[PDB]
Amino acid sequence: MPILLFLIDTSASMNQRSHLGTTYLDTAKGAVETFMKLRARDPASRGDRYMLVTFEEPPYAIKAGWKENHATFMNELKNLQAEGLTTLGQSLRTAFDLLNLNRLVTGIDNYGQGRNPFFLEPAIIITITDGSKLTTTSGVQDELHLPLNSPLPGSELTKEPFRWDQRLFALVLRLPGTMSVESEQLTGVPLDDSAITPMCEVTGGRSYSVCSPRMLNQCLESLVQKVQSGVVINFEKAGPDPSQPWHSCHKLIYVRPNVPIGHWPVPESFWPDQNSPTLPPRTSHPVVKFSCTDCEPMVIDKLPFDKYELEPSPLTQFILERKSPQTCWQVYVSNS
Amino acid sequence: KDLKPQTFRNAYDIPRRNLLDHLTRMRSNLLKSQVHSVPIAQMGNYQEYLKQVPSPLREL
Amino acid sequence: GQVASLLDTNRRHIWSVFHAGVIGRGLKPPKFVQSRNQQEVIYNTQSLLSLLVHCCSAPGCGECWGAPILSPEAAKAVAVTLVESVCPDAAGAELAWPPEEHARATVERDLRIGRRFREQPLLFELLKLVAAAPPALCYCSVLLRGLLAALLGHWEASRHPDTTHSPWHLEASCTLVAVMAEGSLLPPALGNMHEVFSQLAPFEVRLLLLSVWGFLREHGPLPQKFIFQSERGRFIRDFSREGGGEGGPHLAVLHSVLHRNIDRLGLFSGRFQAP
Amino acid sequence: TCWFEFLLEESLLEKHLPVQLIVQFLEQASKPNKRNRILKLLALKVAAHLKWDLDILEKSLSVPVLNMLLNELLCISKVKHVDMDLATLPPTTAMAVLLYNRWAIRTIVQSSFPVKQAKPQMQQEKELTENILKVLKEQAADSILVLEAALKLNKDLKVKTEEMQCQVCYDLGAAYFQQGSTNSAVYENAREKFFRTKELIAEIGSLSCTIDEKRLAGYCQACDVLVPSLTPYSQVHICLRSGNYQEVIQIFIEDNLTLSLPVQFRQSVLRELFKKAQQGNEALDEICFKVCACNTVRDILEGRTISVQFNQLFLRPNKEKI
Amino acid sequence: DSLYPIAVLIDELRNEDVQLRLNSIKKLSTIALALGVERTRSELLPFLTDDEVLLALAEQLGTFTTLVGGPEYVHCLLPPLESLATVEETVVRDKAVESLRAISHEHSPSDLEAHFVPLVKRLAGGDWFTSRTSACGLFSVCYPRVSSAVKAELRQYFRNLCSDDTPMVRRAAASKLGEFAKVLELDNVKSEIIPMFSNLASDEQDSVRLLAVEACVNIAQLLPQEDLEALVMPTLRQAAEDKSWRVRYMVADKFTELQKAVGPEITKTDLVPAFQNLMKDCEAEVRAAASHKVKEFCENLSADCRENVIMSQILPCIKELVSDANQHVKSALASVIMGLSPILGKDNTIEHLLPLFLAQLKDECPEVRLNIISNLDCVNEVIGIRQLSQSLLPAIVELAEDAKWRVRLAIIEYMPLLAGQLGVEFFDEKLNSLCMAWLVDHVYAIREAATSNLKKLVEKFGKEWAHATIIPKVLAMSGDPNYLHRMTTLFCINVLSEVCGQDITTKHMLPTVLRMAGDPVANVRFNVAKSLQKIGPILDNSTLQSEVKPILEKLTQDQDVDVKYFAQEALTVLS
Amino acid sequence: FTKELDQWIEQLNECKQLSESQVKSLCEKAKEILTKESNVQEVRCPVTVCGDVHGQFHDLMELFRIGGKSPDTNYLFMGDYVNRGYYSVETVTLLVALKVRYRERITILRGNHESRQITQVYGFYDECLRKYGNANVWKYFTDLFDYLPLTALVDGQIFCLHGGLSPSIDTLDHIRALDRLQEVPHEGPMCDLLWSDPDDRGGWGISPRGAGYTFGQDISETFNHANGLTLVSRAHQLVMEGYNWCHDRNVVTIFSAPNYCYRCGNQAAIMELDDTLKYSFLQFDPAPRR
Ligand SMILES: [Mn+2]
Ligand SMILES: [Mn+2]
C-alpha cells in the first residue's frame, strides 16, 4: 500500500494572498483535500497511508507519520500555521528520514544481496511550496542543499537521502495577486525553475508550476495519475546509437503485485568479496546501461523470470518508434 | 492558547469587569439553587449523541 | 471632511442574575455626529484651491480676458499625491483601462476609493483642479476607474425606480463624467451625458457609465494622446485624429437611452448631436 | 379555463366575455392539422376581440408568439409586401398588411431600447427573437416603404381613415427618429411625420387609436431642436449654434435670477466654450470669462464651491474683469 | 382525427410534462361533457381501461356519476376500475377500491348481482395477488342489497381468499374482515367467519396475526354474549402468548374495548391472567402498550370485585412497572396510574399509590414527571389537602424548579387547585416564593402561566393579600433593566386590574403604567398603550381624560409605527 | 389590511395555510417592505436572535412559546425557513406575515436554503405542489427570497448572519454594495455569505458542503477587529446543545430546530439579547405533537 507524504511549506512566505483572496497555505491545504478526493475516486486506494511533514523544527516537523489515523492527519492539516522559515533542505531530510527509518529494521533495502524490485515500499513526497528563497536564519541560500549532520544509522550505504521507491514531486504555487488573462493555460504544465526542481528530477519526479486554480486542478489530476507502485531505474546508453534525450532517463518501472512476487535481483554495482569489511555505497537508482545493438529474447519453459513494464518515457518512445518487438536491447549494470 | 481559565476554582481568573456576575454565578453553583464550547466538529455529532441517548420504542 | 462599574452594577442587581454574560463592552456610544457651517467650508476650500492655483499657474499682457496656463507638471504632482493619498496600493497603476470584468476583481479597493470620495468632498475639487491641466488627469486614471466601478456597482444594486433616492451617488456620477469631460478624456458628445442623469432609472445610467468605460478602454487616458499646441501653450487632445474618437459605437447606447425616455429627454437631444 | 377546453366548444369564447389565451394557443399550435388550424383561428378571433391594439399585445405577448400570430393573420388573408401597393387589395387584407408592417417597425424600434438584464427554452426563445430581429433588419426598408405607401393611399372592421394613418405615420416617425442617430438627414423626415401625427391627433380628437401623448410631445420637442427649421434652454442652444454668445451671456445673467436652467447644463456649455477657445477663436476668451463669472455667481447663490476656472481667471485681475 | 377530444386531445397531453398530465387527468370532466353520455361510455371508458396520474384518474372516476349518464349506466365504470385494481402499486389499489366502494351506492341490486359481483368473481379468482387484495377490500358494500343465494357465494369466496397461499392476500382479508363482519348476518358469522378467523389467527406469519388481532374486538362485539367463552376467547388466549412482540403489542392495545365486548364476567375470570402477563412481559413495547390501559381496564370492571382484581395482580405488577428499566414504559404508566385513586379508594390509596407517586415524581425522565403531575386533581379530590400537603407538597415544590419548562407549566396550572383548599397563611409561608419567582422565569410560557395564575390567586385570597404580597413584587419588575420583565409587569397589570377593583387599580397600578411610557424600548411603549386600553374601563373614570389621554397622545406621536398604531387603537377603544 | 393581516396571522398560528390570492397579496407586499431594507440591516437591541427553523412549524410554535410572541418579542431569524420540514409552507408564510404586519419587530434574513435549486431539491417545491397543486406559490416564495436581506447588524457589534465570512469580503461596505436581488450563485461573496461555516483551523478552507468556504479563529478575529464587531452570530450548522461558541467566543452558532430532520435528537436554543447586549440562551426541547 502506498505512502502519500505531504511536505507542506509552513514558511511565512506562504501567507501570500492570491486573486482568490486566500493565502498560499490555504491553497496548499485545499490542494491536499482535493488530491485526497481524487485519490479516493480510485477504488484501489482502500489502503493508503497519508503523512504530513512541515518546515518547523524536527521536534515539531513530523505532524503525522506512521501509526497516525486519518482523523489526526486531517486535524493537523487544518491547523497548520505558516510562521516559519523556508528550511527546505532540513525538511526534505526529515521527510526522507521518516520514509527510510524502517528500512533497516525490516530489511527492504536488501543490502549486499542484490537490488530486488519486488522489495519496495512505494512512497511519493508531494511538497507544496512557493518560489520564495530558502532561508536558514543567516541569509538566503539560492541553492538546495540537504544537510548531512546527524545521519541515521546506515545512511552511508546508499549515499543519497532518497531511495529506490521514492519520488519527490513539487507543487510550486505561483498564483499572482491579480488574475492574469490567459488562453494558453490549457496546455501542458511547465516545469518550475526553483531549487526544488533538480532535486525532484533526480528522484524520478518533477516540479509543477501552477499559476491558476484550473492549472492547480490539472496538476493535482496529473499527481493522482502518478501514484504508482514501482522503483526508479536510471537507464544509460552504453554503446553508440543503433546528445539525444533518450540517452539518460530516471524512468519508473512498474511492480505489479498479485504482495509482489519476483525471483531475480538487479545486480549490485560491485563484486562482493569477504575481504572488504565495509559494504560499498550504492546509488539509490541503479545505473543500468542498455546495449543499443539488437539481440534476441531468450526464454525457456517453466522459467522463473520477472517482467517489469516501464512507464512512458522518451526511452520507451524511442524503442517503440523503432518498431521491432521480435528483438531486444540487452541491459547490464557496470562494474558488476 | 491552552489557558483553560478555572474561574470557578481559581478566583484570580475572574476579570474585574464581570466580577459580580461571576460571583453570583459561583454562589448559585455552590448552593443548592466553558460548557457549549464544543470544538465544532463534535457539536453536530449525529451518531454519537443518539448512541449515548436511550433508544425509543418501535412502531406498530 | 467627515470626522465606577461595580458600584452601580451591584446596586442594579437563589437570586442569580438573569443574563448569562455580556456580548462586548455594553452598548456603543451614540455616534460622533458633528456639524460645520457650509459657507465656511466653501471659503476654506476656496482659499486652499486659490493657493493651489497660484502654485500651479505659470508665473508670467496676453489679452485682458485671458488666464495663465495651469502647469501640467504641477497638476501632475497634485494628481500623484491624490493617487497616493486615496488609493496608495496602486496595483492597477497602469494608465490604460482594464476590461469591465476587472471591476469585480477589485471591489474592496474601489469601494475604499468611493468611501474616501464620499467622506472628503475636497477630493472632487482637487480632481477639478487636476483636470484644468489636460495631461494631468491621465495620472488619476486609477482614481477615476475606481470611483466609476464603485458607482457602477451601486447602480447595479439600486432597486429604486429613479435615481434621486441616491443623491450622493447621482452627483458623484455627474461630477465624475464632468471631470473626465473637462480633462478631455471624453469627447464632448459623450461628455455631456451627466446632464440627463437625474432623469434616468439606475440601469440606464449604469449602461451609460459602462459605455464611458468602453470608450476609455478603446481610447485610454494616456499622456501621449495629448499634443502640445505651442501656439497657446496648452496640451490639446484631438479626438478626431484618434479614429472613432467622437463615440462611434459608444453613442449608440446614449441615443437608445434618449429614445427610450424621449417623453422626458426630448428637450435634451441638442446636447448629444453629432456636430 | 385551459387550452383543451377552448378548443372543444365553438361558442365558449363569447361566454368568456385573453392575452394568456393568445400565448397558450400559439404555444400549443407550434408544439412539435385541423386542430392547429382551429387553434390558430381561435387565437386570431381573440386577437381581433382586442380590436388589434398593438400596445397590449406588444407588452403582453413576446416577439416570436406575436410574429407567429401576425404571420397567421397574413396567411389567412392574402399571401412581396412592397409590391402589393395596397391599392386593389381588400380593406381587411390591406389593414392586416399595414398592421404587420406597423408591428415590425415598432419591434425594430423597440429592440434598440435598453432593458434591465436578468441577474441569473429561454435560450431557444432568445435565439428565435434574435433571428426574427435580424430578418426584420434585412427587411426594414421595405416595411418603411409599405407604411409610407399606406400613408399616401388614404382611399378608405372599418375604422377612421385618419386614425390608422395617424398611427402608421407615428410609427414611421419613431422609425425615422431611431434611424436618425446614424444619419442626421433622417431627422427631417422624422419631424415631418411627427408634425403630421400631431396635426392628425389635434384634428380628430378621438380616443378610440390610442397613442402616448407624452411621448409624442417629447418627440416634437426633440425634433424642434434637432431640426429647428422659446424656452431659455432652446434659446441658449440656438444662440450657441448661431454664435450669438452675448445673448447666451444675457440669458445666463437673467437665469441667475430665476435659477431655471440646470446647473450641469451651464457647466457643460462653459466647458464646451473653453474647449472652443483653447483651439482658436481668440475672441472667445472674453466670452469664456463672462460665462464663467455668471456660473460662479450662480454657484455662490446656491451655496456651492467656487470653480477652479474662476480662480484661474482672477490670477491676473483687470478693471474689465472686476 | 384532430378535433376528437378523447381520441386526440387526451392522447396528446399524455406526452407532456407530468404536471400537465395531472392537469389533463383532472380536467376529464370537460372532456366527458364534450362527448355524449353514450359517446363517453362507448369511447373514453374503453380507452381508460386500456403514480399520481393513476391516483388522479381513480379519484376522477370515483366522482364520475352523472358524466356517464347516471345510475343506469354506472356499471360501465367496472372494467377501468378493475384495470386500476390490478396495478402493482398499492395506493393506486386502495384508491381504486374506495372508488368502487363510493360508486357502489348508485347501483341497483339487480344491477349489483349482474355486474358488480362478477367483478368479485374475477378479482378473487385473479392470478395476481393484487386483484385478490382488491376483492378482499371490496366485499363490504355488495352484501346488504344482494340476495342470500349469492350472499353464500360471497361468504365462500371470502373464506377462499382468507385461505390464500400468498400472505398479503390473507393480510388484506383480515384487515377488512371487521368491516365485513359488521354487516354480515350474525347467524352466518358463527357458521362461516369465526373458524376461518381462527385459522388466520393461527397463521404462520406475524403480519397476518397482527390484523387477526386487529379485528378480534369487532368479532367479539358482534357475536352474542352467551358464546364468547368458546368462540372468540380461545383465539384471544392463543394470541395473548403469541411469539412475536408485534402481535402481543396489538393484543395489549385493544383491551379497553375487548373487555367491553366480551362481557365483564368473562373479563374478571379470563383477561386478568393475560393482562397480568402483559404487565410483566420481557420486552418494553407491549409492557408500555398494556400499561397505557391500566386505568381503562380497571374502571370497566364489576363493582363488587374491582378491588380484589387490582390488589391480587395489577398493583403488585405496578410496583415494578414504576421502577421499570425503560423510561418509555414508566411514562406510559405515569399518565394513567394516578387516576386509579377514585377507583381504588382513599383508605387504601395512602399506603400503596402514594409511595408510587413519590417514586414517579422524582424519575430522571421528564416525560414521567410531566405525565404524573397532570392528573393531580383526582388525588386532590379523593384524598384531601391535609394528606396531600403532608406527602406530595414537598415533592411538587421540589420539581417546580425543574429544568424542563412543561413540568413547571403543569405545576403553575395546578397551583389554583392547591390555593382552593389551603389557607392564606399556610400558602404565604409555603407557596409564594415560587409563585413570584415564576414571573422572572427564562421561558415566556412560564411567565404567562404565572401571570394568568395571579388572577386566580387574587380573586380567591383577597385584595389585601394582593397588596400585601403580589403588588410589591410586581412593582419590583417595573424598574428592572431587562425589557421582558417590564412586559411581564404590564401583563401583570392587565390581569390584575380586573381583580384588584377600581380604587386600588387607579391608585397603585395606574401611576406605574403612565411612568413607564417614556421607556426607550418600543416593545415596552406599545405595551403601555395596549395596557392603558385594557385597564381603561376598569380604572376610575374620573382619572381617564385627566391622565391617560395626554400620555396616549404622546405615545401616538412616537417614532415607531407599532407604538403609534397601538396608541391610536387605545385612543379609539378608550374614546 | 391590518385586520386582514392579523386574521391571517391568527389563522397561520394553527398551521392553516393561506390561499393563492393571500400568498399573492402577502408576498407582493413583503417585496415592497423588503426592498427598502439594506443588505446589512441595522437591528436595534433588544432582539431575540434565532437559528434555522427548517420548516418545523410546531417547533417554531415552541420557539414562540419560549421566547415570546411577536410583536412583544423582537425576533431575528437567520434563514433556512424551509426545506425538509413537514410544514415549510406554513412556516415561511407565517414568518413572512409577521414581517409584513410588524416590519420593525422582526427581521428575516436570507439563508442558503432560500435558493431556487435548493428548494427544488430538498422538498419545498414538492411541499408546494402537494399543498397547492400548481407551482406558482413556490416561485412566488423564491421571488420573495430574492428580496431578503443578507446580513444583520445589532448595535454595530453583533454581526448576525446565516453562513460565515468570505475570502472576497473584508468589510461590511462590501456586503452593503452586494447586489442581493439575485439567485444565490454557486460561487462568490454572496454564496460565501450564505453557505460558509467556521472550523477549528488555521485559515480558509473549502467547505464540505460544496458551496462556500470554511474559516478559522484568525479569520474571525481579523474580520471582527477590521469592522469594529464583538461577535458574529451564525445559524447554518447543526448544534446538539442548541448553541455553541467558537473561535474564543467570537462566533456563536445557534440552531433553532429541535430534533432536526425529526431524527437528529438535538436540543435547540435561541439567543436573547438584552437592552445592553446582555445575552441569554434559552435551550428548548422539541414540542410534543398530538
Ligand atoms: Mn440549514
Ligand atoms: Mn443553512
PDB file of N, CA and C in Angstrom, chain C residues 47-67:
ATOM      1  N   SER C  47      -9.962  79.159  -0.373  1.00  0.00           N
ATOM      2  CA  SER C  47      -8.614  79.586  -0.008  1.00  0.00           C
ATOM      3  C   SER C  47      -7.574  78.550  -0.415  1.00  0.00           C
ATOM      4  N   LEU C  48      -7.840  77.277  -0.109  1.00  0.00           N
ATOM      5  CA  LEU C  48      -6.894  76.216  -0.451  1.00  0.00           C
ATOM      6  C   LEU C  48      -6.721  76.084  -1.962  1.00  0.00           C
ATOM      7  N   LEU C  49      -7.826  76.103  -2.708  1.00  0.00           N
ATOM      8  CA  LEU C  49      -7.735  75.966  -4.157  1.00  0.00           C
ATOM      9  C   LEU C  49      -7.154  77.201  -4.827  1.00  0.00           C
ATOM     10  N   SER C  50      -7.367  78.397  -4.277  1.00  0.00           N
ATOM     11  CA  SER C  50      -6.718  79.573  -4.844  1.00  0.00           C
ATOM     12  C   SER C  50      -5.215  79.535  -4.609  1.00  0.00           C
ATOM     13  N   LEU C  51      -4.787  79.053  -3.438  1.00  0.00           N
ATOM     14  CA  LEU C  51      -3.360  78.852  -3.205  1.00  0.00           C
ATOM     15  C   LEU C  51      -2.787  77.805  -4.154  1.00  0.00           C
ATOM     16  N   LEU C  52      -3.534  76.726  -4.394  1.00  0.00           N
ATOM     17  CA  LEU C  52      -3.069  75.691  -5.313  1.00  0.00           C
ATOM     18  C   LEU C  52      -3.007  76.198  -6.748  1.00  0.00           C
ATOM     19  N   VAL C  53      -3.955  77.045  -7.150  1.00  0.00           N
ATOM     20  CA  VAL C  53      -3.934  77.617  -8.492  1.00  0.00           C
ATOM     21  C   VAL C  53      -2.765  78.585  -8.642  1.00  0.00           C
ATOM     22  N   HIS C  54      -2.482  79.373  -7.601  1.00  0.00           N
ATOM     23  CA  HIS C  54      -1.316  80.253  -7.626  1.00  0.00           C
ATOM     24  C   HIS C  54      -0.022  79.458  -7.733  1.00  0.00           C
ATOM     25  N   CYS C  55       0.063  78.331  -7.024  1.00  0.00           N
ATOM     26  CA  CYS C  55       1.251  77.489  -7.125  1.00  0.00           C
ATOM     27  C   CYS C  55       1.339  76.804  -8.484  1.00  0.00           C
ATOM     28  N   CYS C  56       0.197  76.418  -9.055  1.00  0.00           N
ATOM     29  CA  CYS C  56       0.178  75.620 -10.274  1.00  0.00           C
ATOM     30  C   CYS C  56       0.280  76.455 -11.540  1.00  0.00           C
ATOM     31  N   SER C  57      -0.044  77.739 -11.477  1.00  0.00           N
ATOM     32  CA  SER C  57      -0.007  78.576 -12.662  1.00  0.00           C
ATOM     33  C   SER C  57       1.424  78.945 -13.020  1.00  0.00           C
ATOM     34  N   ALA C  58       1.658  79.141 -14.311  1.00  0.00           N
ATOM     35  CA  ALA C  58       2.962  79.582 -14.779  1.00  0.00           C
ATOM     36  C   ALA C  58       3.124  81.073 -14.509  1.00  0.00           C
ATOM     37  N   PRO C  59       4.130  81.491 -13.740  1.00  0.00           N
ATOM     38  CA  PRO C  59       4.315  82.925 -13.468  1.00  0.00           C
ATOM     39  C   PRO C  59       4.853  83.641 -14.698  1.00  0.00           C
ATOM     40  N   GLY C  60       4.099  84.625 -15.175  1.00  0.00           N
ATOM     41  CA  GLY C  60       4.486  85.377 -16.355  1.00  0.00           C
ATOM     42  C   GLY C  60       4.131  84.677 -17.652  1.00  0.00           C
ATOM     43  N   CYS C  61       0.467  91.285 -22.548  1.00  0.00           N
ATOM     44  CA  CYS C  61      -0.382  91.027 -21.392  1.00  0.00           C
ATOM     45  C   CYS C  61      -1.178  89.741 -21.569  1.00  0.00           C
ATOM     46  N   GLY C  62      -1.195  89.224 -22.794  1.00  0.00           N
ATOM     47  CA  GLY C  62      -1.986  88.046 -23.103  1.00  0.00           C
ATOM     48  C   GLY C  62      -3.477  88.277 -22.998  1.00  0.00           C
ATOM     49  N   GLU C  63      -3.958  89.413 -23.521  1.00  0.00           N
ATOM     50  CA  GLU C  63      -5.349  89.874 -23.523  1.00  0.00           C
ATOM     51  C   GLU C  63      -5.865  90.200 -22.124  1.00  0.00           C
ATOM     52  N   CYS C  64      -6.845  91.101 -22.049  1.00  0.00           N
ATOM     53  CA  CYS C  64      -7.435  91.487 -20.776  1.00  0.00           C
ATOM     54  C   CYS C  64      -8.377  90.434 -20.210  1.00  0.00           C
ATOM     55  N   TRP C  65      -8.701  89.394 -20.975  1.00  0.00           N
ATOM     56  CA  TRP C  65      -9.623  88.361 -20.534  1.00  0.00           C
ATOM     57  C   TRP C  65      -8.984  86.987 -20.418  1.00  0.00           C
ATOM     58  N   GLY C  66      -7.728  86.837 -20.816  1.00  0.00           N
ATOM     59  CA  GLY C  66      -7.088  85.542 -20.775  1.00  0.00           C
ATOM     60  C   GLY C  66      -6.742  85.110 -19.364  1.00  0.00           C
ATOM     61  N   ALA C  67      -6.361  83.842 -19.252  1.00  0.00           N
ATOM     62  CA  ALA C  67      -5.947  83.274 -17.986  1.00  0.00           C
ATOM     63  C   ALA C  67      -4.575  82.636 -18.146  1.00  0.00           C
TER      64      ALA C  67
END
